[PDB]
Amino acid sequence: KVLKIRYPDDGEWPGAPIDKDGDGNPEFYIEINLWNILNATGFAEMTYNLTSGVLHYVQQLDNIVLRDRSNWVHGYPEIFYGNKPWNANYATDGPIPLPSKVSNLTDFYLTISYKLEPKNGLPINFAIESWLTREAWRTTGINSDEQEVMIWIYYDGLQPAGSKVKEIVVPIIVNGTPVNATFEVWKANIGWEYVAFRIKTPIKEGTVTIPYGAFISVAANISSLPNYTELYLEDVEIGTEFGTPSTTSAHLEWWITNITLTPLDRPLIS
Ligand SMILES: [Ca+2]
Ligand SMILES: [Ca+2]
């Protein structure tokens, strides 16, 4: 039927597996993940139609107070594949064997169909994220010698952490058209190493395809981390960070109607 998770009714941390064939190995995992909201009024609800495959998120939050203003954004309601290292949730029923070492993975395309409707000027992005960890099956967080990589294919009013390194051009596909797209590369120290690729021409809705290794190769190339090839690419998460400390009302709706990961016959790291 329809899988539904809701904040605050299901608790602090609503989330659920998507396990179509009931094999106890989910294909994807969804979380509302309001991880820097200490208190708010209102609600956020995510539903997944097990027939149409449509994930739909509706958020009407007000009177927001953050856990830690220095963490900047409010949360990252999302769907992911792989092992998310901040908790015991995972989804590994898919064609890409995450978690695996970067040095052992082949490249893959990530294709997402979506439509974003932030309301009232709300700062948001639509960002794909992966964590790279010393341990494949981490469930308790991230250490200072590990990495977070984000790829922002939409943003309005939000800036990545840290500082701008350079611009790169990556061949991507936008609504069926091959596009050589420019991304700004940003790098931060926030408790671990962070690298974000923020596209220069953000895409508010449609179907976007990226070659994942174009981004992980650059993140490897610019890393300050030692023994980068020891790292496991844990997962691929897709969601919307939203809000800054200026934001006390965050009303947002979106839909993601397909996620596909397509293996390629070439290494991840070029
Ligand atoms: Ca399954
Ligand atoms: Ca709003």
Author numbering: 50 to 319
Authors' own words:
The hyperthermophilic glycoside hydrolase family endocellulase 12 from the archaeon Pyrococcus furiosus (EGPf; Gene ID PF0854; EC 3.2.1.4) catalyzes the hydrolytic cleavage of the β-1,4-glucosidic linkage in β-glucan in lignocellulose biomass. The hyperthermophilic archaea Pyrococcus horikoshii and P. furiosus have glycoside hydrolase (GH) family 5 (EGPh) and family 12 endocellulases (EGPf), respectively. The optimal and denaturing temperatures of EGPh are 100 and 103°C, respectively, and those of EGPf are 100 and 112°C, respectively. EGPf appears to be a secretory enzyme because of its signal sequence at the N-terminus.
Here, we describe a new crystal form of EGPf prepared at pH 5.5 and compare it with the previously solved EGPf structure. Based on initial screening results, high-quality crystals of EGPfΔN30 were obtained using a reservoir solution consisting of 100 mM CHC (2:3:4 citric acid:HEPES:CHES) buffer pH 5.5, 200 mM lithium sulfate, 5%(v/v) ethanol at 22°C. The average size of each crystal was about 0.7 × 0.5 × 0.3 mm after one week. This was a new crystal form with symmetry consistent with space group C2 that diffracted to 1.68 Å resolution. The final model contains two monomer molecules with 270 amino-acid residues each. pH5.5, poor electron density was observed for the loop regions of B3–A5 (Gly131–Asp156), B5–B6 (Thr182–Asp194) and α-helix–B4 (Ser272–Glu283), but the regions were interpretable. Comparison of the structures at pH 5.5 and 9.0 showed that the structures of both main chains are the same. Comparison of the EGPf structures obtained at pH 9.0 and pH 5.5 reveals a significant conformational difference at the active centre and in the surface loops. Glu178 seems to play a role in controlling the optimum pH of the enzymatic activity. In conclusion, crystal packing is weaker and the quality of the EGPfΔN30 crystal at pH 5.5 is lower than at pH 9.0 because of the flexible interfaces 1′ and 4′.
